[PDB]
Amino acid sequence: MYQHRDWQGALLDFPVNKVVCVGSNYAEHIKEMGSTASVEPVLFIKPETALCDIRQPVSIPKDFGSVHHEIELAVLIGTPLKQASEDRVARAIAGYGVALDLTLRELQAGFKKAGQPWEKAKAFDGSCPISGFIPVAEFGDAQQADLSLTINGEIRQQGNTRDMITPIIPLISYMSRFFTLRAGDIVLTGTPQGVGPMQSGDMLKIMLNGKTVNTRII
Amino acid sequence: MYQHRDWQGALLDFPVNKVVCVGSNYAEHEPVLFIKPETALCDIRQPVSIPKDFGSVHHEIELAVLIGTPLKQASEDRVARAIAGYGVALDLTLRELQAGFKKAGQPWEKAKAFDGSCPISGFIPVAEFGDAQQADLSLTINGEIRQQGNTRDMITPIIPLISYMSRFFTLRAGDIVLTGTPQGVGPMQSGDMLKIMLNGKTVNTRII
Ligand SMILES: [Cl-]
Numbered sequence: 001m002y003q004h005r006d007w008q009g010a011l012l013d014f015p016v017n018k019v020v021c022v023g024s025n026y027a028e029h030i031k032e033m034g035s036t037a038s039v040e041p042v043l044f045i046k047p048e049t050a051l052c053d054i055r056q057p058v059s060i061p062k063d064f065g066s067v068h069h070e071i072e073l074a075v076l077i078g079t080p081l082k083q084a085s086e087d088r089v090a091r092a093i094a095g096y097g098v099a100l101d102l103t104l105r106e107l108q109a110g111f112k113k114a115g116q117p118w119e120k121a122k123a124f125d126g127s128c129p130i131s132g133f134i135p136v137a138e139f140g141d142a143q144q145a146d147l148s149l150t151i152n153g154e155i156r157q158q159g160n161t162r163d164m165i166t167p168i169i170p171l172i173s174y175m176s177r178f179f180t181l182r183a184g185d186i187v188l189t190g191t192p193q194g195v196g197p198m199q200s201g202d203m204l205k206i207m208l209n210g211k212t213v214n215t216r217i218i
Numbered sequence: 219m220y221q222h223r224d225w226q227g228a229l230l231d232f233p234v235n236k237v238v239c240v241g242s243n244y245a246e247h248e249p250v251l252f253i254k255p256e257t258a259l260c261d262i263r264q265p266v267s268i269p270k271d272f273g274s275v276h277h278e279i280e281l282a283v284l285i286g287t288p289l290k291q292a293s294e295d296r297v298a299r300a301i302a303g304y305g306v307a308l309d310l311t312l313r314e315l316q317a318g319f320k321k322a323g324q325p326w327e328k329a330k331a332f333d334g335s336c337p338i339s340g341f342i343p344v345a346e347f348g349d350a351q352q353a354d355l356s357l358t359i360n361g362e363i364r365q366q367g368n369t370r371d372m373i374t375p376i377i378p379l380i381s382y383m384s385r386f387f388t389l390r391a392g393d394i395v396l397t398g399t400p401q402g403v404g405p406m407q408s409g410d411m412l413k414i415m416l417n418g419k420t421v422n423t424r425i426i
Binding site for chain 2: 017018023038042043044045047048049082111112113114115116117118119120122123124125178179180182
């Protein structure tokens with residue numbers, strides 16, 4: 001089972017339960033998916049079995065079609081939130097990290113056309129490789145963070161959270177109307193443009209502001 | 219806080235994690251799969267809370283299955299040995315919200331995964347439950363029978379269903395599987411008095 005860690009690799013003591021995620025949160029990503037924005041945030045969830053340490057080799061399933069990377073800012077909740085105001089949300093954030101919301105894109109496309117749930121495409125084992133968390137105190141302005149994903153030496157995604165359609169705080173406030181977010185829950189804030197396929201053997205370099213993690217698909 | 223129990227209410231030693239569920243698994247109502255998180259779970263014997271601004275909330279009575287040993291890409295034989303017990307649950311669904319998501323091709327989590335959306339009973343051990351593919355399920359609201367069905371009518375039976383699920387999601391010991399709902403799904407409201415039956419074992423509760 002996955003365990004939360006700080007950037008240095010130290011174990012953190014928060015419980016692990018779920019990851020609440022937003023789709024269609026960057027306009028350029030909405031455009032490359034051929035979709036449109038939604039009136040309210042598009043929400044889905046990944047279970048504990050999706051979570052894994054991004055610093056270790058990242059396993060992807062081989063039989064379900066192509067697996068696409070979606071780099072995203074991850075937010076660690078340190079205090080439980082239910083129907084929480086924006087101010088309560090702000091005070092509840094423990095740290096920030098970077099994840100890949102790995103997606104079986106072909107399946108997802110079929111689910112969308114059939115009006116079917118996304119879990120098989122978004123929730124599968126290991127579909128959420130994630131970094132250690134950076135303290136709120138050292139992270140700076142969360143809504144201005146840079147994210148970059150380089151695969152085999154080529155930049156694939158490079159973006160900044162300033163481009164979020166629904167900003168972090170109101171987003172988390174919104175999510176808490178539906179789901180109690182326990183201490184130790186993680187929130188994924190969406191992916192910018194550049195989403196694409198990965199295959200076994202690819203080398204990944206991932207950066208969150210000035211900080212780097214490296215790994216390999218395998 | 220929700221913890222797993224046996225039918226009578228004693229604590230079972232299994233952690234609580236997630237609930238893996240199937241849609242459209244009975245005719246009158248590749249398996250459609252979705253998941254509810256731990257925050258969906260609550261004790262069915264206690265008054266049941268439903269949300270007020272999300273539209274109609276509908277009951278779906280279903281046979282619930284407690285996983286007692288971990289399953290990943292497991293054979294039907296391994297699955298059978300894995301089951302620790304059986305219970306009954308309501309898969310509460312915000313139907314109008316869901317009708318919206320289906321049309322737009324959005325995920326179902328808001329409609330299926332919301333807090334308290336899995337009221338569930340205690341579990342009866344496998345040895346004492348008899349044939350789980352023959353189980354009677356019954357839901358009466360305010361004296362009127364709303365759902366009445368039997369698991370023999372499952373489109374995909376329990377064992378193959380759980381085997382299929384494990385191809386996608388690892389099922390930890392303590393995970394619960396929901397098997398689908400028979401026909402008669404309908405809205406519930408505050409004040410509703412509920413009588414639930416699993417093979418004649420009766421539990422009563424109420425909404426609000
Ligand atoms: Cl009894």
